[PDB]
């Protein structure tokens, strides 16, 4: 349902838990 | 229904919790 | 009826962000 | 158009996870 995921530039550390039912 | 995940740049370690359920 | 997960650098050192199960 | 995982970094380390439709 209109899934728009954009990510620019990465990294080594940090924790990102992205969760989308769609 | 309509979702945009705009994430850019990094940084030191941390706890990023993102959850989209609609 | 439209989620816009945005984030460009910054963020404070902790465990947060934004979550909604509804 | 529905699937837009615009990714540009390759950062494999850290805690990165995307729940594409669970």
Curated annotation (Swiss-Prot), chains A, B, C, D:
It is found in: Secreted; Cell surface. It comes from the Eukaryota. Glycans are attached at residue 22. Heterodimer of an alpha chain and a beta chain. Beta-2-microglobulin is the beta-chain of major histocompatibility complex class I molecules. Polymers of beta 2-microglobulin can be found in tissues from patients on long-term hemodialysis. B2M alone (not in complex with HLA-I) interacts with M.tuberculosis EsxA (ESAT-6) and an EsxA-EsxB (CFP-10) complex; the tripartite complex can be detected in the host endoplasmic reticulum. The B2M-EsxA complex can be detected in patients with pleural tuberculosis and is stable from pH 4.0 to 8.0 and in the presence of 2M NaCl. Belongs to the beta-2-microglobulin family. Component of the class I major histocompatibility complex (MHC). Involved in the presentation of peptide antigens to the immune system. Exogenously applied M.tuberculosis EsxA or EsxA-EsxB (or EsxA expressed in host) binds B2M and decreases its export to the cell surface (total protein levels do not change), probably leading to defects in class I antigen presentation. It is linked to Immunodeficiency 43: A disorder characterized by marked reduction in serum concentrations of immunoglobulins and albumin, and hypoproteinemia due to hypercatabolism. Patients may suffer from recurrent respiratory tract infections and severe skin disease. This is Beta-2-microglobulin. It comes from Homo sapiens.
